[PDB]
């Protein structure tokens, strides 16, 4: 294998790098996998699409401007280039390599389209309509947006937006699902908590987070029980940034955050998806919980679950690993259909004050077709009324003992409309046994005399009933 001449990629040290600290992309590409017969799009403010690094890869049947109801997702030019951003993420999926251009995509030869879509008023209708492009042409689709945030927001997708995740993953692919690959908030500085993110807290999105350079949680990064795994982007000034196609055909080594991070995950997932065209959204993401790698991420909350895998909220399972991904792929055994197991945890409603456990042991829907001894995704669908939402921290503990933060305090967050059947989701669990005693505690992390009642606690559990691994 000859690894690519272009001049930047040099400084693409998140693939290229010789010292650990990278993606593993490379192992990938010289396993045969580059992203040949992929199709990955991007929602964003659009793509340019002549664009010297991406016209040779670029795809109209991936593209569309729903903010102008055209096939055209071409960027409009402004003085401040504003609407660069779709730009820079089409390059880290798949800029062209070998080309003597800027750098190189991490699936270099996959295909690359954008939706034009941010430009405008986006509404629930402008949101499903791009999330439904073309499912059946279209694998994978990266999207570096969501709720403001503030930390003080509490959103994710109306009906529309709704609907169409569940028509993606169900019948898109040719009924495998549709990818969604979903950056996990820029909130940090807010102290926002990206349980509060109904696009990234959704089962059907993958959810990716950051680690600067030298190994570090970003000033930006929003931890949460929702996320999956973590790529590198942008730190501090003395550490390096993401190296892509820039507007108006340049290149730039200078973009940042987790909108950075997302496209890179669904570069890695589109090497894999050519590594084994016949894996179902569900399968994709088992395969990122198996490989994904700890090492040399640092946090202060790295725990052992139930089946012996370090998770954090800042970073989930760990850096992606593109050449353990496509390795596993290959001969990955399709999982099971998807089990839900439903159980309402209350007899009465509870009131809050300073603090509230709720303990409820559950078969898990045991001597049922819904029976799950293997989690997938969990939900506590919680409502509630409280005087000052941010002043709530919200955890959930597994039987195997495995602590899920659903809701960190949020400063910001003055709110007094609680939480109206929020479906808290947590990865933290994945392949462990679900029955068993869940606790539930909901607190409260300020002084002051707040005051409220949890009404719903719906315990909701997906997974399967077969096919298990000796614990890691
Ligand atoms: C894809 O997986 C399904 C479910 O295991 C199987 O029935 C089908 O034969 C597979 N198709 C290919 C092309 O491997
Ligand atoms: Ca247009
Ligand atoms: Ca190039
Ligand atoms: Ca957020
Ligand atoms: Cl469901
Ligand atoms: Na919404
Ligand atoms: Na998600
Ligand atoms: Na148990």
Redesign the pocket.
Known sequence: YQEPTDPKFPQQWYLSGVTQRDLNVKAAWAQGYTGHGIVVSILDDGIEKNHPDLAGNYDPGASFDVNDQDPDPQPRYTQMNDNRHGTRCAGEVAAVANNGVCGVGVAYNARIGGVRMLDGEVTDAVEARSLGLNPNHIHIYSASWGPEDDGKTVDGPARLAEEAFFRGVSQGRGGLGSIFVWASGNGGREHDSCNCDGYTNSIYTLSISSATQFGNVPWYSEACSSTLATTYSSGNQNEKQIVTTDLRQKCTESHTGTSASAPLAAGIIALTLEAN??LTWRDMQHLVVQTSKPAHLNANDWATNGVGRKVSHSYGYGLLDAGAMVALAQNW??VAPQRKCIIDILTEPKDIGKRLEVRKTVTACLGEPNHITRLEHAQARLTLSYNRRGDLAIHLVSPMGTRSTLLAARPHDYSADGFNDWAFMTTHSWDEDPSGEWVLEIENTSEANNYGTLTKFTLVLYGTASGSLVPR
Do not use: D, L, R
């Open positions: 065209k016949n055994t399709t």
